[PDB]
Amino acid sequence: VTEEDLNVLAQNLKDLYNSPAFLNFYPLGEDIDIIFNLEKTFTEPIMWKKDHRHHRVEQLTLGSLLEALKSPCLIEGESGKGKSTLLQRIAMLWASGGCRALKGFRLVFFIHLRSARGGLFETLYDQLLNIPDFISKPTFKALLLKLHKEVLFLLDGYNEFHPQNCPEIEALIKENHRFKNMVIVTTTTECLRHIRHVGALTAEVGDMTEDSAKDLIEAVLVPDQVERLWAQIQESRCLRNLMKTPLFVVITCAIQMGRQEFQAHTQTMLFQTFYDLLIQKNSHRYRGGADFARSLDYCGDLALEGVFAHKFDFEPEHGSSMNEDVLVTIGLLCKYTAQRLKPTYKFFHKSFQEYTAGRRLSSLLTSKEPEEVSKGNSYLNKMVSISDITSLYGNLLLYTCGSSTEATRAVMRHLAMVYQHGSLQGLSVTKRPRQESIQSLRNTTEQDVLKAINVNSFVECGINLFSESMSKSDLSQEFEAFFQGKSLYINSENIPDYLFDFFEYLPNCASALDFVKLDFYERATPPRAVSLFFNWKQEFKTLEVTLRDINKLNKQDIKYLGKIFSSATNLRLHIKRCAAMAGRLSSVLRTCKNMHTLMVEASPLTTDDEQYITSVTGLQNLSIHRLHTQQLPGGLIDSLGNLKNLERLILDDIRMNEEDAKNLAEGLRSLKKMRLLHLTHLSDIGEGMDYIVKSLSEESCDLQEMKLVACCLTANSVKVLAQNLHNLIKLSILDISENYLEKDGNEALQELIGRLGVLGELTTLMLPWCWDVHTSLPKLLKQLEGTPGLAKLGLKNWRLRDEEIKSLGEFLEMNPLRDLQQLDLAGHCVSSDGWLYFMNVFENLKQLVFFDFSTEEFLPDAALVRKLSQVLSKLTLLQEVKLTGWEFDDYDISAIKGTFKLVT
């Protein structure tokens, strides 16, 4: 692998990216005169750094993004936003030397992910064509690995990518640690779920500014046509909105070249104007036969099957290209000029394939031939799961509904019938996910959270379809059937125009939603949100609102929030890191029929607020985090008994003392509905837990979750818990962890372990620690023989030794836990050989999400590490790996990386 050869490779890539062929392309195809140049026609876009919650953190430039690069980096936006051109721009900048950020890269490869087949080498070789003859697939792979992060891959259109065709590139994106090259991946917002978990940086391509839009217009158009078109843009609002995306700008430019005056109100109508214009101009070239319509039908079917088969390139066998060729003559599709093994065709953009397919689908559904309608409904029947619908079929239905009203009837009638989620993969809004959100608190499982998100996205798709349908109130019957029992997500910082249409023309659907989730970021009063909610009178079953980082609150903010909260019969409220809520909890909530749940997190609360919280007796869920204000009479915990309907209580980091703990105990006696209790991180409450535990377990209970952690738990309280454990039968979750039992600790703990048989449904056990805890390990395992469904197990600071570690291993082999999701063994005494033995059984729990092996400073033998990486490969479901005190500095770290987050 001579360095000469590497330089010849780099020179070839640079030659390709610097050629007029790479620099210039026809956006709309070779048969329409518009030419885009990566250097000259390119206007700098605005980009946004993205937060897990899909909120925009920071504004960026391409240069700043390249400067800040972390891999994998994901660039997202709606179709036609300019992402592909962004990648081509990066490639061109690297060649030019024009960018300092890219100077670190020895090699940059740009490929369209759509044409990825075979393996990485074959794809690069076949696409780029400039790869030296004597560099071979193994030699090339070794070259990339050796070259490390000095290689930049620009991968375009993951939405156009079917990963089974090329698993190697899929791995290049998804497992980047094996490769250690840098990757930048392009995808739509719709399909972002597929790559979301993988990306270390996420940026969105923003809308196109009027200056930039007209810059593009002026470039590709003659001046008369430039001002004529611009007048048309400024006179119509819809066109102005359509001009925020560059592709549509190019398309209207093309329309303007053909047509003097045009009316398109929707992006579907833009495409329709263009298509109709194409037939009008180019119909005359077909001199061949008696059928034009048969050819158009062929095009529509080509696009339709294309979307469903995920095939955006069309290669018929050689000699059979006749219909495709006729379609090239008309200009509906383009054939690849570059030399291909066989003739290959495509639509100028994916969105045009989607439009042609939508026009075809609508034409089938609205057809006067029962057969065609049957085929169209058959196409609809291919859409089962919402996952496929929002991502794969989303644009298909946008143009389908956009084309005809009758078609929206069929589509909405179908979507209302859809019970299937599909893939829940990329939906997570948190990091390795109760207490984190209402969504975590109110939902029993993570899957439920993901499903909830999926429904939000499904509904947004539905509203998009609603706006494109352009039927104001006419379809309200069909639409309400769809939206009913579903949920809507609204970000006050980002409000789409179709939300206004939805609220305006369809108030019944907004009321038919089970709930609306409202998010406020840093501002209690965006004005656009105010406009959205106030303009028309809405009524909501439930409003779920989260107030984020609001440290400034005034009268306008409070009164306005009151008006917004009054829109719903039920209200669920989360206050996160809000320093502006002091006296204001009572005033903000002044008009509420029902407040269902309240979450206050890392926010200061005065005695007035505490009093108001206990004042509302209808509260079924209460979670407060970090109250450092001392408790007085009339306080939060003094009268906790006021809320008798509370089914979930979470108290975290509460300033309390022994008497406060006793008052809390007396209060817990009065809550008969509690199925969830978390008392966590309570310090200085002396013996308060003896009192607290008694009140909980004294009587027969509905309690299904108890987390007592870092609160001061006494061995007496654990003994009481053991004695009264028969009173809480339904408990599936017991976390007593992070507690030391001082005296009679092992006796009390064994006493508890002995009474574990009482709990039939117990899926989670987290144990406290004491002197000689490990001696209780055999006893615990016998109890666990009758607990095959244990999801979470931990013994923290039990100091397990090799005898205990093999004991647990043998237990695991004989009595396997096949559902065990996470294992916490912390502060253990395990030899490197000891862990090495354990890796054998450790390999076979595949449902393991999280494991903590942390300990006192410990150097794993390398032989242990080899197996560490290998077992980590065998476990696909790892979300979190926590190894603390393990020494990996120079040597073993490179192989230990994974999709999961690792803590060292």
Ligand SMILES: Nc1ncnc2c1ncn2[C@@H]1O[C@H](COP(=O)(O)OP(=O)(O)O)[C@@H](O)[C@H]1O
């Ligand atoms: N920075 C830019 N300035 C001006 N026009 C642009 C810019 N980026 C893209 N365009 C135009 O928008 C069209 C669509 O770009 P493309 O990247 O294919 O869409 P997508 O982002 O969906 O892949 C291009 O043909 C180009 O003419």
